[PDB]
Design an enzyme around this catalytic site. Structure first.
Site, PDB file in Angstrom:
ATOM      1  N   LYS A  23       0.861  -1.175   0.000  1.00 15.55           N
ATOM      2  CA  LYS A  23       0.000   0.000   0.000  1.00 15.55           C
ATOM      3  C   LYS A  23       0.894   1.220   0.000  1.00 15.55           C
ATOM      4  CE  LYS A  23      -3.789  -2.383   0.552  1.00 15.55           C
ATOM      5  NZ  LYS A  23      -4.857  -2.557  -0.457  1.00 15.55           N
ATOM      6  N   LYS A  49       1.981  -9.606  -1.451  1.00 21.39           N
ATOM      7  CA  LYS A  49       1.338  -9.699  -2.751  1.00 21.39           C
ATOM      8  C   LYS A  49       1.259  -8.299  -3.332  1.00 21.39           C
ATOM      9  CE  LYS A  49      -3.234 -10.151  -2.967  1.00 21.39           C
ATOM     10  NZ  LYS A  49      -3.501  -8.757  -3.527  1.00 21.39           N
ATOM     11  N   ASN A  50       1.266  -8.230  -4.644  1.00 18.05           N
ATOM     12  CA  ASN A  50       0.917  -6.999  -5.320  1.00 18.05           C
ATOM     13  C   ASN A  50      -0.513  -6.648  -4.970  1.00 18.05           C
ATOM     14  OD1 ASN A  50       2.581  -7.610  -8.486  1.00 18.05           O
ATOM     15  ND2 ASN A  50       2.816  -5.753  -7.311  1.00 18.05           N
ATOM     16  N   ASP A  51      -0.809  -5.373  -4.780  1.00 14.75           N
ATOM     17  CA  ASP A  51      -2.195  -4.959  -4.720  1.00 14.75           C
ATOM     18  C   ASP A  51      -2.748  -5.286  -6.127  1.00 14.75           C
ATOM     19  OD1 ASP A  51      -4.637  -4.051  -3.751  1.00 14.75           O
ATOM     20  OD2 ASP A  51      -3.782  -2.255  -2.839  1.00 14.75           O
ATOM     21  N   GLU A  52      -4.000  -5.767  -6.223  1.00 14.59           N
ATOM     22  CA  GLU A  52      -4.581  -6.279  -7.481  1.00 14.59           C
ATOM     23  C   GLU A  52      -4.335  -5.454  -8.752  1.00 14.59           C
ATOM     24  OE1 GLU A  52      -6.924  -5.414  -4.882  1.00 14.59           O
ATOM     25  OE2 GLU A  52      -7.554  -3.531  -5.843  1.00 14.59           O
ATOM     26  N   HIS A  60      -7.278 -13.757  -7.287  1.00 13.93           N
ATOM     27  CA  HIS A  60      -7.823 -12.535  -6.698  1.00 13.93           C
ATOM     28  C   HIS A  60      -9.191 -12.331  -7.377  1.00 13.93           C
ATOM     29  CE1 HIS A  60      -8.340  -8.431  -5.405  1.00 13.93           C
ATOM     30  NE2 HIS A  60      -7.488  -8.724  -4.419  1.00 13.93           N
ATOM     31  N   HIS A 111      -9.148 -15.837  -2.453  1.00 11.97           N
ATOM     32  CA  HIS A 111      -9.666 -14.944  -1.425  1.00 11.97           C
ATOM     33  C   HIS A 111     -11.072 -15.386  -1.078  1.00 11.97           C
ATOM     34  CE1 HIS A 111      -6.711 -11.503  -1.498  1.00 11.97           C
ATOM     35  NE2 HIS A 111      -6.184 -12.414  -2.305  1.00 11.97           N
ATOM     36  N   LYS A 171     -13.346  -5.433   6.773  1.00 15.04           N
ATOM     37  CA  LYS A 171     -14.058  -4.278   6.177  1.00 15.04           C
ATOM     38  C   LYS A 171     -15.092  -4.654   5.094  1.00 15.04           C
ATOM     39  CE  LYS A 171     -10.742  -3.242   2.395  1.00 15.04           C
ATOM     40  NZ  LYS A 171      -9.519  -2.473   2.043  1.00 15.04           N
TER      41      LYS A 171
END
Ligand code: CAP
Ligand code: CAP
Ligand code: MG
Ligand code: MG
Ligand code: MG
Lengths: 455, 455, 160
Positions: A167, A192-195, A288, A322, A330
């Site tokens: 992030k 992990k890479n953010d999507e 993802h 996931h 959240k």
């Protein structure tokens, strides 16, 4: 037109349809639109549009066609329930290897039936796949065992994989990106890479992959522990996915088995998932599901549930998917979502309507993500019952007041607390990084552990 | 956490954001869930989860990241309207050719934001793509012009392509399948595979393809007119799609330019669409959207509309896409859906919120299908205003009482009636196949043409 | 691909977009990679399009990959300086089909976000229709620039 005499046979027994092994069974929550046919008439038209028919009689129909009709075998109108049996001969197979394709399953069972003018809504809650069809699916080639082995953990019940997401979601240039990787890896296992991270003009793919590889080597030298990275290789173009994956493995070289490949399987589709499963079967395939919420949300009465999405992902060959935070993070999700985890990890499991035997098909890891942090983890594990999984906390690690390394350690310590059966507030007195997660997320601390400040 | 000061700038002008050419704009109909933040606070979090943020502050954020934030620039809470500006630098690009990918557009603009716990629902109704991003998309390589050229029609306003779908949807073995093709082609132009037809155990792909090639040769010899077939090449595996397409072109030989390739783009995904667009750019790419109704239905308040789906398909490179019957057939759809047809065919068009310039990107044909027949066609064309398209009628042709050839001729005659501005009942007195469509679908004739039997 | 696709990249109308101002890098052969890229930069301060002179490729004194990288850097610097898009037409001609692919793939990957500013030049008369078709079918989204060196041996009115 009333097609109930042809497409409905309520005298068929579900236990006989299962024992026969010749039918895929789907369970739907459906409501007819007012002013058309009754429940059984609407369910029969639904079966016709999902197998051999249309909305009118055609003179090209023969008795061979009638034998492969999908059939409504069970209805429960007060509970809006419709169960249909699909002869397995209906489903398309590859010419090249005789194997099944999930695109055909989707096309027939949740395709054109979603645009019917006489149906208010219809959503798939479960499906049963018999052995003759199940065995034609790829299934996972790599599992959490292969990540545990790289970490030096036992390959049976190797335990919790401490993870994060880099992030900001987008915005870090290659060196700031790899600096955040290095910092987290001083205390954690997996990143992990953010999507959406890939080849943005401000963070070119090849420069980021090289900087991240350097940060992995430096963090392994510093800690003496193996580190893992899950790169996003999603693309519309099959050849771009291959180009990204091949470049990463070559670049990581002797650390190539520390690499997982992330695919945005819901938006790019099963075709992208299959590209990574078949091209890179020895690399952990991280599915993802960005965008799934448009149909899986309980607010939606259409498409299919997250349970159905997850079950399909195991057949497609996801090493992990996931599954959400089961109401502890959240996103939308409930405590009952623990049944999704058991369906994708066990050899035999119960769905909301159908029990499934997996016949030794490899398990898919539940990947836990979405607003998680050290404070929310003990409650999450109490509901699930185990921590043989990957959990990624982006905000939970990079929002830790003492940095990414302390963020990683707070997640490690939170699962130790749960494993030891300790009281989180009492445990925090002897574990600083975990204690400092209370001061990092004080609104969560006040909600979960009311008099934490006094202690 | 309130992120409205960072992710909302309501002083930005939409005309300046468009003129700047540096932002993708999306218009959503959104409703916050009760008990969380107000409208602007929820829209700001929605923009954060769709670009650079998460649900909490992270200490890795820098000012460069803040510059690429997606911004809420216009709200109208009374109409549940939210408009977000996305800097074009956010969107992923191919390493191999620097081109855009729709998977990145989807991931950011309608990805994780669909699983937000504080949002009741959010659906995208329109999007604007500026020139700098638009020009990076493939766009269509083959169009209706290429089909008109094969048919010997003018390449400008070549007219109506009389189509059908082979019905039963599944069940015909290779020779019965090819016999129905031949019969239809004696009076019509185009035949498509029903969306799930491929390589079923009772109708193997290669045997069916060979039998249809033989039927095409025999129908062309008998009539002296060119005939077209759209074959389903959908698969999870990219290499299966190639194997199917290569076999068909080699088999059809001197009739290889009479072949279109059908892809179930919604269920197989953009990856499958791109496989067919990039591997076979000289073959008409027929985008079938089975399953789309799970989000596009007006009953759904999530995902995106059929207008948004269609607009994306033109960027992906679909030569044609199913746009529905605009309320004149069996599926969900309205008269106002004619605006979808204009957006995909014209060089400049208006969406519900944004005007779009296509900069000479090729048009995508509206493919009209779903419970159509000769009787429903004049009303359909009155609403659209033109017949420069492909209409497929499965039930409408194979449900014709005098057979497939008469079924085909009734569709040809129905468009001639509309083109001549004639009264359908008066026109039917001198056109038998059209007249016999009244006796084939009498419930439709009674509703559309009340005293047809007397005349 | 047509001139529409070059006009679109330049920000010109896609119908009757007008004149594209171009040059050929001269000397025909002899410039090493940085002097070559310096001449590119200089021309692009006032012009739109540059093509390789027909025999420029992978000469021992101007290796292909070094020249391609230096030109990509010159395109980025000229675009930053002028605020206008610039175009380059690279010679990818070869006897070997796989060499043509290797050259074209390297150029597109190197130019990255400027990959749609690239045209591919083929010496179609001397290498033949086979070389032209290799470029047309492998790179249909890149402008195919047909160079006809040698044609004069038959097309000249002096030839009957
Ligand atoms: O972009 C994000 O929001 C995440 O990286 C989580 O980051 P945070 O830890 O900061 O929340 C994940 O993509 C979501 O969890 C996906 O949702 P799901 O797992 O349900 O599919
Ligand atoms: O299978 C079918 O139902 C159809 O072949 C229509 O056949 P009929 O003519 O017999 O009705 C089409 O696939 C649908 O119209 C697709 O939906 P849409 O066009 O909306 O995408
Ligand atoms: Mg993410
Ligand atoms: Mg169909
Ligand atoms: Mg020259």
């Amino acid at each position: 037109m009333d097609q109930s005499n042809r497409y409905a046979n309520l005298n068929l027994k579900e236990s006989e349809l299962i024992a026969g092994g010749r039918h895929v069974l789907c369970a739907y929550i459906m409501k007819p639109k007012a002013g058309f046919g009754n429940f059984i008439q609407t369910a029969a038209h639904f079966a016709a549009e999902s197998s051999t028919g249309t909305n009118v009689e055609v003179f090209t129909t023969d008795d061979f066609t009638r034998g492969v009709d999908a059939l409504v075998y069970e209805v429960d109108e007060a509970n809006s329930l419709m169960k249909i049996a699909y002869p397995i001969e209906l489903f398309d197979r590859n010419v090249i290897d005789g194997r099944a394709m999930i695109a055909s399953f989707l096309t027939l069972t949740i395709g054109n039936n979603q645009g019917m003018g006489d149906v208010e809504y219809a959503k798939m809650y479960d499906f049963y796949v018999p052995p003759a069809y199940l065995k034609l699916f790829d299934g996972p080639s790599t599992t959490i065992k292969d990540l545990w082995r790289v970490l030096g953990r036992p390959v049976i019940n190797g335990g919790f994989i401490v993870g994060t997401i880099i992030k900001p979601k987008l915005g870090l240039r290659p060196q700031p990106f790899a600096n955040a990787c290095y910092d987290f890896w001083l205390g954690g296992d997996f990143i992990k890479n953010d999507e959406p991270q890939g080849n943005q003009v401000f963070a070119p793919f090849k420069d980021t992959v090289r900087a991240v590889a350097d940060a992995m080597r430096r963090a392994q030298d510093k800690t003496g522990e193996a580190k893992l990275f899950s790169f996003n290789i999603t693309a519309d173009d099959h050849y771009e996915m291959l180009a990204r994956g091949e470049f990463i493995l070559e670049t990581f070289a002797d650390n190539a088995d520390h690499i997982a490949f992330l695919v945005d399987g819901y938006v790019a589709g099963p075709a992208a998932v299959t590209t990574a499963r078949r091209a890179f079967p020895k690399q952990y395939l991280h599915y993802h599901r960005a965008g799934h919420g448009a149909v899986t949300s309980p607010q939606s009465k259409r498409g299919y549930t997250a349970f159905v999405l997850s079950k399909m992902a195991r057949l497609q060959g996801a090493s992990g998917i996931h599954t959400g935070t089961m109401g502890f993070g959240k996103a939308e999700g409930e405590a009952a979502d623990r049944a999704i985890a058991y369906m994708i990890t066990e050899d035999a499991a119960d769905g909301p309507y159908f029990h499934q035997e997996w016949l030794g098909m490899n398990p898919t890891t539940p990947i836990i993500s979405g607003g998680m942090n050290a404070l929310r983890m003990p409650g999450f594990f109490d509901n699930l019952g185990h921590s043989n999984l990957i959990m990624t906390a982006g905000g939970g690690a990079f929002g830790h007041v003492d940095g990414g390394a302390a963020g990683a350690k707070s997640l490690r310590q939170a699962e130790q607390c749960w494993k030891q059966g300790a009281d989180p507030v009492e445990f925090a007195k002897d574990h600083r990084e975990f204690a400092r997660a209370f001061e990092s997320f004080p609104q969560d601390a006040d909600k979960l552990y009311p008099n934490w400040r006094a202690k």
